[PDB]
Design a binder for this molecule. Sequence first.
Ligand SMILES: [Cl-]
Lengths: 242, 242
Amino acid sequence: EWQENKSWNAHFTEHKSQGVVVLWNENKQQGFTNNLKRANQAFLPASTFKIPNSLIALDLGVVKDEHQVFKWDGQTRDIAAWNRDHDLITAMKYSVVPVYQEFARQIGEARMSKMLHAFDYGNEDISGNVDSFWLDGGIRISATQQIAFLRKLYHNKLHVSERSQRIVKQAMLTEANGDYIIRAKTGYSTRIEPKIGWWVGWVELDDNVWFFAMNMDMPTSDGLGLRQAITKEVLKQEKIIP
Amino acid sequence: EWQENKSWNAHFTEHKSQGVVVLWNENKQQGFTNNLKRANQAFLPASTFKIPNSLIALDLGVVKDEHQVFKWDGQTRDIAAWNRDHDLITAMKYSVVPVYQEFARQIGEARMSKMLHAFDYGNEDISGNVDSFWLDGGIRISATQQIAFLRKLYHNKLHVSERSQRIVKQAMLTEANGDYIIRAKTGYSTRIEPKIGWWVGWVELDDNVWFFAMNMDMPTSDGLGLRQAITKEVLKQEKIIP
Ligand SMILES: [Cl-]
């Protein structure tokens, strides 16, 4: 069941922004959003694709464990954090595209396509460069589809090993305190209009889990922090977090 | 190699307290403490024993997974947080002794003894009530021994399944942000003098891990927050965290 709560638009308007936030109460099995249409609108996943990419890479042995070092290829790139060695944990934390482009090439398009079908991931279309299709290729997914995918991951019900799903959920760790735990992943699609930013994941509470998926128009990189800020304002409004 | 930093005693004295803080730089394989003598002094583990107890219960199947509900036994206790259903995550978070006492009874004395010897855990002496020996029994462990045990857990080198060690490290999650992750467990020994408080765990950074183990005299519960405060205060002085 899905209910539309348009009052969340205040958080977008007050931040000179436009987008969608989708929430899912696991205990009640009930979803909420401010925009039904945009919640089901299909976008490029961008770096949110690092979640399924990690799962496949781990299960195929392309990645041994979360501490296997992937050496810098020496090429200086704009993002200074990319110009260094990384493991799975830091590669996720800093959204290091080049490391995951190497994962995709070793996975290959054949295994990438077939294993993404097992996840029921978006339109299941990887047409484009095997190492950039989630950035300028044919793959598309909606916020509600992110939720469905994330719920399977949380419950270890994706068709990969439990170990791989545990490692990725560890690598998704973003914030934790005495009130909640957030496991999530940011995204930032810029190669194909409209430019947008993602934040998908869930909030773990003592007695419930709140899955979330949001995307918003991102004409400039100045507003990237609004992906998390607007989400936390919805969470606060619903008394999910203090 | 071990170096003594007596300047950290300022953090204990200024709080009208006495104790030890032990740190271990994993990358450099170097330990630091304010009191070499007390760093090797053995105490009752108290609720810090919930770490090995969780490992044993998981590995033996006493606990299915981290979300298996353990129903309240109906008995009202002083700590209100104990008077409710718990899973492994919340049982750790709120140090629910009674839930872990039932684990110990189901593990049994023979399997408990064998597993602690495999862990090289303290003096490996479980004499006393099988469901309270870590509170008023014969088992003893020092701050340096806590580190050594925790390092095995971090590296999945303990003699249990990798899954068991991953679940417990998940259950140990205490704090996480863009700067560090803390996985730890508090302790509070009161049944046998001297009353003390524990905090054992480690700090995960991008490029290093800092294991820590601290205990301090705890004549009254007024100073339980000093377990984390004094630890985070040494970490601050040593430029480990902001
Ligand atoms: Cl975790």
